[PDB]
């Protein structure tokens, strides 16, 4: 059961890493959108 | 898929352990005791 | 690129479904009836049977998209009847590479090799490097203050 | 050995798919950066 | 870890196969035997 538990833990951590990467990408895109909006406001 | 493989491995190991303990119990016993039933003289009873 | 991504995703889904399965543990009558009932045709009905194309281009001056309709039965701009339509490509990557080669946005202060490559790739851009018909900057809307 | 070979092939295919996805993401980010640079040049 | 798990599974498989073979071979031997009789036929008894 140790190998199965290790595999389950690896799957859980890779899922968590994928979710964290997706959240980071969403935050980066939101920051880019906010910067573009600020640039547009500065040149309005 | 990993969970299914884990459950299959668990059941396979459980079956292997059951077979091992059954064979160990058979070894401890002097003879292979098996159920018998027959209504006659001292003949060979049937094996279940 | 989007079509390639979609087909790759559909292939991935198909292979996942196959692995799961392996291991577990037609308007002819409608047209006739419409012709019989309505008994009238308009140009905006023949193109309804085929998918259309919408190319909106809005602006902050007025809240109204600039809807553009393109014919689907002809090999025009935006039509998809025989294959890949016009994409207007192969004219930006070279310019971007030339601009990023020396980290200078202005092509006038670039190397001779970059200028030669730009001239060869863009025949219409050779008339700007020779400095013909001088004009102050590039102001297409000069008629107003000129007059 | 057939099941082990199939598992190894699945691992190799999933690693290749992950690498292809990473390369596609890198290409997309590079294209976005080039487009932003071209937009900045057009408004320079 | 997966490679180690597969090697452990293979070694356990061959170990239990060897154990099953050993138990099957050991079950065959019985060694019951019977005591002496009152001379079989008329010239040769059945001794040890």
UniProtKB/Swiss-Prot annotation, chains A, D:
It is found in: Virion tegument; Host cytoplasm; Host nucleus. This is Large tegument protein deneddylase. Interacts with host CUL1 and CUL4A; these interactions inhibit the E3 ligase activity of cullins. Interacts with inner tegument protein. Interacts with capsid vertex specific component CVC2. Interacts with the major capsid protein/MCP. The chain holds residues 2716 to 2759 of 2763 of the full protein. The lineage of its organism: Viruses, Duplodnaviria, Heunggongvirae, Peploviricota, Herviviricetes. Large tegument protein that plays multiple roles in the viral cycle. During viral entry, remains associated with the capsid while most of the tegument is detached and participates in the capsid transport toward the host nucleus. Plays a role in the routing of the capsid at the nuclear pore complex and subsequent uncoating. Within the host nucleus, acts as a deneddylase and promotes the degradation of nuclear CRLs (cullin-RING ubiquitin ligases) and thereby stabilizes nuclear CRL substrates, while cytoplasmic CRLs remain unaffected. Belongs to the herpesviridae large tegument protein family. It comes from the Viruses.
């Amino acid at each position: 059961l140790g190998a199965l538990a290790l595999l389950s833990q690896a799957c859980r951590r890779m899922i968590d890493n994928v979710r964290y990467t997706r959240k980071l990408l969403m935050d980066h895109t939101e920051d880019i959108f906010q910067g573009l909006g600020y640039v547009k406001l500065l040149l309005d | 898929v990993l969970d299914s493989l884990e459950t299959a491995a668990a059941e396979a190991e459980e079956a292997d352990a059951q077979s091992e303990e059954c064979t160990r119990t058979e070894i401890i016993r002097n003879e292979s005791i098996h159920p018998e039933v027959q209504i006659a003289k001292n003949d060979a009873p049937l094996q279940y | 690129a989007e079509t390639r991504i979609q087909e790759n995703n559909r292939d991935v889904l198909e292979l996942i479904k196959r692995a799961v399965n392996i291991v577990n543990s037609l308007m002819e009558w409608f047209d006739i009836c419409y012709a019989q009932l309505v008994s009238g045709d308009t140009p905006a009905d023949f193109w309804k049977r085929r998918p259309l194309s919408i190319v909106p281009r809005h602006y902050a001056e007025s809240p109204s998209p600039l809807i553009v309709v393109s014919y689907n039965g002809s090999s025009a701009w935006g039509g998809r009847i025989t294959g890949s339509p016009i994409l207007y490509h192969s004219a930006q990557a070279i310019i971007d590479a030339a601009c990023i080669n020396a980290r200078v946005d202005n092509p006038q202060s670039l190397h001779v090799t970059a200028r030669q490559e730009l001239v060869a790739r863009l025949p219409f851009l050779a008339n700007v490097l020779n400095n013909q018909t001088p004009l102050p900057a590039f102001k297409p809307g000069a008629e107003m203050f000129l007059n």
